[PDB]
Amino acid sequence: SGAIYVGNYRVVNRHLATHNDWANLVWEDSSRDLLVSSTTAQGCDTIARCDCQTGVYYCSSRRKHYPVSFSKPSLIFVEASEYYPARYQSHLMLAVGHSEPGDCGGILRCQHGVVGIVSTGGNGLVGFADVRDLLWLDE
Numbered sequence: 414s415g416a417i418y419v420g421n422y423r424v425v426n427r428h429l430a431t432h433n434d435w436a437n438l439v440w441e442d443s444s445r446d447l448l449v450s451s452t453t454a455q456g457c458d459t460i461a462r463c464d465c466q467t468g469v470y471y472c473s474s475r476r477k478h479y480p481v482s483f484s485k486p487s488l489i490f491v492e493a494s495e496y497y498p499a500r501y502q503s504h505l506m507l508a509v510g511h512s513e514p515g516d517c518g519g520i521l522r523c524q525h526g527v528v529g530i531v532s533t534g535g536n537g538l539v540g541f542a543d544v545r546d547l548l549w550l551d552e
């Protein structure tokens with residue numbers, strides 16, 4: 414679990430979105446595993462605007478933060494789950510690191526701010542849904 418709070422928006426993994434998230438829906442994209450809902454309170458997370466390939470993510474299944482090198486956002490094949498059929502997930506970045514399904518929602522940050530959230534995992538690879546291209550999150 415986990416979310417990004419920026420301005421009047423809440424960014425979560427689409428597969429973990431609540432009834433409240435869907436009732437205040439702003440935007441969602443199944444191909445990216447993202448959902449953004451509106452909030453009443455103000456968010457102060459800074460979204461990174463960059464091409465960094467190094468950062469730190471939070472891993473709840475280890476209660477630890479790990480530094481990682483990660484790939485450029487791209488279309489990557491992802492296995493079927495109770496949430497999606499087998500498909501290409503877009504805007505996904507991979508890194509060598511530990512993750513388990515409940516780790517979804519952990520933030521990846523670089524020196525510029527929030528880069529994305531944990532979304533996929535398996536075989537010692539962790540995948541993060543990028544949010545740096547969503548320029549409207551700031552305005």
Ligand SMILES: Cn1cc(CC(=O)N2C[C@@H](C(N)=O)C[C@H]3C[C@H]32)cn1
Pocket residue numbers: 428446491494495496497502512513514515516517531532533534535540
């Ligand atoms: C962080 N993490 C996720 C997994 C499994 C995994 O790859 N998943 C894929 C995800 C998706 N974006 O399609 C849906 C849920 C089932 C999860 C393992 N560690």
Ligand SMILES: [Zn+2]
Pocket residue numbers: 461462463464465523524525526
């Ligand atoms: Zn950066």
